[PDB]
Amino acid sequence: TGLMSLDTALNEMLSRVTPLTAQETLPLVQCFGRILASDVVSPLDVPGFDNSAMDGYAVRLADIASGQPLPVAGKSFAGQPYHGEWPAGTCIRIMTGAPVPEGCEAVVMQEQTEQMDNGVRFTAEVRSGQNIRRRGEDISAGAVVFPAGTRLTTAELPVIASLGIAEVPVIRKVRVALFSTGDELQLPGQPLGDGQIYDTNRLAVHLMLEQLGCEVINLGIIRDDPHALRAAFIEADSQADVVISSGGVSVGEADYTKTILEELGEIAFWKLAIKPGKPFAFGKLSNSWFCGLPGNPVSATLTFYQLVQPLLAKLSGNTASGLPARQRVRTASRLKKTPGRLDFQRGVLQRNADGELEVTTTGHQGSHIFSSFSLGNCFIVLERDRGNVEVGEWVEVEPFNALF
Amino acid sequence: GLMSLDTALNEMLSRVTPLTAQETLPLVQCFGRILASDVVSPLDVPGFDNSAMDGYAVRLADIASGQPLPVAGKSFAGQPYHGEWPAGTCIRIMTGAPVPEGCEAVVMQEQTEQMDNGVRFTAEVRSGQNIRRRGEDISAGAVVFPAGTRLTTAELPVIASLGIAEVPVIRKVRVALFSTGDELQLPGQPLGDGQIYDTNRLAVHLMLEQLGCEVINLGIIRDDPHALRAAFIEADSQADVVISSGGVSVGEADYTKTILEELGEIAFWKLAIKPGKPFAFGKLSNSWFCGLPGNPVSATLTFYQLVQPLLAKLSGNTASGLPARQRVRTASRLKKTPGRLDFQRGVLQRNADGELEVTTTGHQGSHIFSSFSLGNCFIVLERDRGNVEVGEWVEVEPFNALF
Numbered sequence: 168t169g170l171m172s173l174d175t176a177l178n179e180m181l182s183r184v185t186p187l188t189a190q191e192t193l194p195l196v197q198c199f200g201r202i203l204a205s206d207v208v209s210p211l212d213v214p215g216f217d218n219s220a221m222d223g224y225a226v227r228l229a230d231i232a233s234g235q236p237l238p239v240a241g242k243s244f245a246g247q248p249y250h251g252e253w254p255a256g257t258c259i260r261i262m263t264g265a266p267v268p269e270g271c272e273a274v275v276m277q278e279q280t281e282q283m284d285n286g287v288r289f290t291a292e293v294r295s296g297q298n299i300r301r302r303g304e305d306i307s308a309g310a311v312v313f314p315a316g317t318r319l320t321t322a323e324l325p326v327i328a329s330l331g332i333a334e335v336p337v338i339r340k341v342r343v344a345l346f347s348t349g350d351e352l353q354l355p356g357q358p359l360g361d362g363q364i365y366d367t368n369r370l371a372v373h374l375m376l377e378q379l380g381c382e383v384i385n386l387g388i389i390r391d392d393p394h395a396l397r398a399a400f401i402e403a404d405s406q407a408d409v410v411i412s413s414g415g416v417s418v419g420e421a422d423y424t425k426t427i428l429e430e431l432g433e434i435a436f437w438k439l440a441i442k443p444g445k446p447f448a449f450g451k452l453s454n455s456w457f458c459g460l461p462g463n464p465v466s467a468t469l470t471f472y473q474l475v476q477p478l479l480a481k482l483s484g485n486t487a488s489g490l491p492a493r494q495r496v497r498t499a500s501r502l503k504k505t506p507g508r509l510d511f512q513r514g515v516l517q518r519n520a521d522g523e524l525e526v527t528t529t530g531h532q533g534s535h536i537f538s539s540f541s542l543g544n545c546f547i548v549l550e551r552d553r554g555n556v557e558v559g560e561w562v563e564v565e566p567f568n569a570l571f
Numbered sequence: 572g573l574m575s576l577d578t579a580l581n582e583m584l585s586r587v588t589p590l591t592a593q594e595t596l597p598l599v600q601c602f603g604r605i606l607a608s609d610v611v612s613p614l615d616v617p618g619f620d621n622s623a624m625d626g627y628a629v630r631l632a633d634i635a636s637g638q639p640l641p642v643a644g645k646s647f648a649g650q651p652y653h654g655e656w657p658a659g660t661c662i663r664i665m666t667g668a669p670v671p672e673g674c675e676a677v678v679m680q681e682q683t684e685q686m687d688n689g690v691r692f693t694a695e696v697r698s699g700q701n702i703r704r705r706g707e708d709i710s711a712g713a714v715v716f717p718a719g720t721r722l723t724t725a726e727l728p729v730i731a732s733l734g735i736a737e738v739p740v741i742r743k744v745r746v747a748l749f750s751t752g753d754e755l756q757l758p759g760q761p762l763g764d765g766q767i768y769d770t771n772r773l774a775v776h777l778m779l780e781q782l783g784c785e786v787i788n789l790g791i792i793r794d795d796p797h798a799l800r801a802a803f804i805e806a807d808s809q810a811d812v813v814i815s816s817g818g819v820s821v822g823e824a825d826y827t828k829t830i831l832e833e834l835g836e837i838a839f840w841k842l843a844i845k846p847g848k849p850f851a852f853g854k855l856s857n858s859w860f861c862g863l864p865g866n867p868v869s870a871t872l873t874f875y876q877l878v879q880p881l882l883a884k885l886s887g888n889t890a891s892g893l894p895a896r897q898r899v900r901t902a903s904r905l906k907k908t909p910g911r912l913d914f915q916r917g918v919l920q921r922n923a924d925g926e927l928e929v930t931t932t933g934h935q936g937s938h939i940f941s942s943f944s945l946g947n948c949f950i951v952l953e954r955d956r957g958n959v960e961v962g963e964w965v966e967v968e969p970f971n972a973l974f
C-alpha cells in the first residue's frame with residue numbers, strides 16, 4: 168500500500184478539534200505560559216502624564232530667549248513633584264520620570280548648561296518638546312494591548328502590570344490522562360522478574376506534558392489483563408480532555424488490546440512516512456480524544472513531539488502555533504538516508520571558523536539507543552525523497568526547544 | 572571611562588563559588604535540577620537478548636534442511652519459553668520477548684508461509700539477524716551521567732531505565748528581591764500624584780522562577796532610610812543573592828547610596844553598553860548584591876546578560892558559559908554609534924531563498940518595552956562599529972525561553 172505524509176496526518180488531526188473555552192482568573196505572577204481567554208484592553212493612558220526623559224532643568228522658551236541666567240525656583244522628583252511658585256524668568260531642576268511643571272515647554276540636559284552666579288545659562292539651542300515623553304504616546308486608553316489566545320511570557324506580563332491590572336482571565340489547563348500497558352513493564356525501585364525491563368516512556372511523556380503546562384493524571388502501569396485494561400480506559404476518559412497510551416496498546420497489530428480499543432471508541436490506525444517510527448493511533452473516545460504511541464522509546468518520543476505537542480497547543484486555545492522554525496545550514500558529516508520517509512535525525516549545531524552555524528551528527532541513529540537526545544541540540548530534517556548527503560550540501564535543521 | 576562587559580562578568584564570576592549542599596528527589600520532580608553526584612549503572616540494558624520483530628526464532632541448521640518447521644512453542648513479552656525445542660522445529664516469538672536457549676536467528680512473519688506440515692521460510696537467513704543483544708545500549712558499571720549535568724527529558728528517562736527512582740541534586744539558589752521609591756504603586760490600587768505602577772519587580776520575579784531559583788519577594792519599600800536598612804538585613808539573612816530591581820543608587824549620591832556603602836562593600840560600574848550603563852555589585856554580610864538601573868529596558872537587559880550567568884555558576888551547572896550567537900546578513904539599515912556594544916532587538920526569519928536574515932523591530936528607544944514582544948533575538952553590535960547598511964553581516968543572539 169502507501170505511506171501517509173506528516174503534514175497530512177497533522178492537518179487531519181487539527182481540523183477535528185475545538186479549542187477549550189473554560190477560563191479562570193489568576194494574579195500575574197502565576198501566569199507564565201498560560202493562554203489569555205479574552206483581549207486585554209487598557210483602562211489608562213501610558214504614560215499617564217507628561218514627564219521628563221532626562222535629568223536636567225525644565226524651562227519656558229520665552230525665558231531662554233533672554234540670553235540671561237535663570238535661577239532655580241525649585242526641584243522636581245518622581246517621588247515628590249514640585250508644586251511651589253514658578254515665577255517668570257526662572258527654571259526648575261527636574262529628574263528622570265518626574266512630571267513636567269505647569270507650563271513647561273522643554274527639558275535641557277544637565278550637560279548643556281553652565282552654572283552662573285545666581286542663575287543657569289543654557290548652551291546650544293532648545294527645541295519645543297525636547298526630552299519630554301508625552302501622555303499616551305505609548306498606549307491609548309481603550310486600545311487592545313494583547314489579543315485573546317496570546318501565550319504570556321516575560322515579554323508581555325510586565326506590560327500588563329504597567330496598566331495596573333493585578334489579575335487576568337486565562338483558559339484552564341488541558342487535562343491529560345496517561346498510562347502504559349505490558350506484563351514486561353516494572354516500576355522504579357522494584358526487582359525485575361523473568362523477562363522484565365523498566366518503564367521509561369511514561370516518565371518521558373509525563374515530563375514533557377508538565378513543561379507544556381498541562382495537568383497530568385498518571386495512572387501507572389496496567390498488566391496484560393482484558394478486565395483491568397477496559398477499566399483503565401473508562402477511568403482515564405472520565406476525568407480528562409486527552410488520553411495517551413505511552414506504549415503497550417496496539418497501534419495497528421491485531422492483538423487483544425486492539426479489540427478493547429475499538430469497542431470503546433472510533434479509532435484510526437496510521438502508517439506515517441517518517442523515521443524513526445511509523446505507526447500511530449488517533450481517535451475519539453466517549454468524552455475525550457485518544458493518542459496511542461509506538462513501543463520504541465525513540466519512536467514514541469519523536470511522535471509525541473511532532474504530533475501530540477501541536478495538538479495540545481490548539482486545544483489550550485493558543486493561536487500562535489507551528490513549533491520552532493527551521494533554517495538551512497551546511498553539514499560537516501556524511502549522512503546516510505533512504506527515500507520514501509522524512510527522517511528526523513539527531514545532530515549537533517556549532518560555529519565555524521567564519522561564524523556561521525554548521526551541523527555534525529551525534530553518531531548512530533538507530534532506535535536502540537536514547538543518548539542522541541542528550542548529545543545533540545537539534546533535529547536534522549531530511550526530505551522524504553532524498554538519499555545520502557555528502558559534506559558541504561545544504562540541509563534543514565530544527566533546534567530543540569526547552570524540553571531538551 | 573567605561574568598562575567592557577567581558578571585564579565586568581569575569582570580575583563577578585571569579586569572586587563566587589558554586590553551591591554543594593544536596594537533597595534527594597524522585598525523578599518526576601527533577602526537571603531543570605543539577606545532578607549532585609555521578610550516576611553509575613548497576614544493570615545491563617537490555618538485560619537480555621531479545622527479538623526485534625514479531626515472527627520466529629530458529630537455528631541455522633534447520634533452515635538449511637529446506638523442510639517446513641512446525642511450531643514447538645511460544646515466547647511472549649514477560650512470558651519467555653523454557654520448554655522443549657527439538658530438531659526440525661521453530662519457536663513463535665513476539666517483539667521484545669527474549670530468545671530461547673540456542674537461538675541463532677529471528678525471521679519476520681512476512682518472510683514466511685504457513686504450510687500444512689509446518690512453517691516455511693522464504694528468504695535467506697543471516698546469523699544474528701533481528702536479535703537485540705544484552706548490553707548493546709548500556710553496560711553495567713559505567714558512569715551514565717556526571718555530576719554537574721542539568722536534568723531534562725533527554726536524561727531523566729535514561730536514568731529510569733536503570734531502575735533508579737531518586738537521585739541527589741544541588742539545593743535551589745535562594746534569591747531575595749525588592750524595589751524602592753515613593754512613586755511606585757501596587758497593582759489594583761489608585762495612582763497618586765506622580766505615581767506609576769511597579770513593573771521591574773514582576774519581570775525579575777518571573778525570570779528568576781523560570782531559571783529554577785527560590786524567590787523571596789519583599790515588595791515595595793518607600794523612601795525611608797529606616798525601612799531600607801530593615802529590607803537589607805531581612806534579605807541578606809536568608810539568601811545567596813540579593814537583588815534591587817530599582818530605586819537604589821547605581822552611582823548617584825543620595826540617601827540610598829549611603830546606606831548601601833554602610834552595610835556592605837559595593838562597587839558602582841559604568842558599562843560600555845546600550846541601553847543602560849550603570850550597574851552595582853558587591854558583597855553583603857552573608858550574600859552577593861546586584862543593583863539594576865531604573866529604566867525597564869536597561870534592567871531587563873542588564874539582568875539577562877550579567878545576573879543570569881552568575882546564577883548559573885552558583886547553581887553548580889557545569890555546562891558551557893558562552894552565549895549562543897551567529898552571524899547573518901541584515902535586511903534593515905541599522906543606526907549605530909561607536910563606543911558602546913549595542914544590544915538592539917530584531918527579527919530573524921527565512922528569506923524566500925531559504926536562509927536567515929534579520930530586520931529591526933522598529934524604534935530602539937528605551938522609553939518603551941514592546942521590542943521584547945515583537946522581537947525574537949538580539950543584534951549585538953560591536954563596540955567600535957558605526958552605522959550599518961543592508962547586506963552587511965552582524966552577530967545575533969536568539970532569545971531563550973524567558974521571552
Ligand SMILES: [Mg+2]
Nearest residue numbers: 348349415648
Ligand atoms: Mg505488549
Ligand SMILES: [Mg+2]
Nearest residue numbers: 246751752818
Ligand atoms: Mg527613587
